[PDB]
Amino acid sequence: GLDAAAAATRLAAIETSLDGRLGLFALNTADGRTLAHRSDERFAMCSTFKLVLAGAILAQSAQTPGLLERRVAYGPEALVSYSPITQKHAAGGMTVAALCAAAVRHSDNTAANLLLDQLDGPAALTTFARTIGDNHFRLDRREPELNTAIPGDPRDTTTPAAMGRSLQRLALGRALPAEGRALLCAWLRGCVTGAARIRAGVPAGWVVGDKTGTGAYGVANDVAVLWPAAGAPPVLLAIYTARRQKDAAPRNDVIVAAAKVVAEWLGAA
Numbered sequence: 001g002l003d004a005a006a007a008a009t010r011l012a013a014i015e016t017s018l019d020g021r022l023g024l025f026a027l028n029t030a031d032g033r034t035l036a037h038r039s040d041e042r043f044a045m046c047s048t049f050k051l052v053l054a055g056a057i058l059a060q061s062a063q064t065p066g067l068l069e070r071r072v073a074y075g076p077e078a079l080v081s082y083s084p085i086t087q088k089h090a091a092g093g094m095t096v097a098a099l100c101a102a103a104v105r106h107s108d109n110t111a112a113n114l115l116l117d118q119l120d121g122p123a124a125l126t127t128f129a130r131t132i133g134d135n136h137f138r139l140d141r142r143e144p145e146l147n148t149a150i151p152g153d154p155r156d157t158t159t160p161a162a163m164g165r166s167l168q169r170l171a172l173g174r175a176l177p178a179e180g181r182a183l184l185c186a187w188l189r190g191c192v193t194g195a196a197r198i199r200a201g202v203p204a205g206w207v208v209g210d211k212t213g214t215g216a217y218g219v220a221n222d223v224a225v226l227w228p229a230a231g232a233p234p235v236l237l238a239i240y241t242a243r244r245q246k247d248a249a250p251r252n253d254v255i256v257a258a259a260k261v262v263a264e265w266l267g268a269a
Helices: 004-018 046-063 096-105 109-119 122-131 160-172 178-189 252-266
Strands: 020-028 033-037 207-214 220-227 235-243
Touching: 004 020, 004 033, 004 252, 020 160, 020 252, 033 160, 033 252, 046 096, 046 109, 046 122, 046 160, 046 178, 046 207, 046 220, 096 109, 096 178, 109 122, 160 178, 160 220, 160 235, 178 207, 178 220, 220 252, 235 252
Parallel strands: none
Antiparallel strands: 020 033, 020 235, 207 220, 220 235
């Protein structure tokens, strides 16, 4: 694969093209090696927090089996922003599992808020992150307010390394029982909001499970498990971007280019 020193120069050049801050952490579980660029700096999570939210709900279900099929009641007054699944189901409600799937696969905002209610709020989700060894994640607000992404504001932020290591524990490790880990990975593989991000920068035969986020200041993020081939050791990849003015455009091309560097570092052509 591409030497880590040359990967570093390529990520720096991609950041120049972004005109902003690129945050990247990759961990190859085959050898335990990493690639890092601003991996210990804070970035606004936007909807990438929903992966940790789904994990927290699965962890709650490990403690109290049956939670996932219990029904949540809500009304249309609770609908916020992009809520494509929850807007269809207010009359009859949705199960906890259906809300998790909507939050991960579709980024459904109201689903995320209803799951935060089930967990007892942003601070409770932050505590869950601390229990899985993440000292950087912090959720402070609910949807749709957590996407302001003001440079330097620590609210609703993480670091790329913290998120990558949390994704490893949740999707590949024992933060959850094997059944719950498997379900989380199934939801991530079913994400339909990230085709133009990490997925577009890796070889055609790789399987991707991801969660996107997008916000003000041109924020465009994608956090993924990469499976190069059936049975091969997976790779964790957390990519965060932030730009320099409030109304900046997101730069998917930067995420794609950074993912391609990671693929080359792993040995892809």
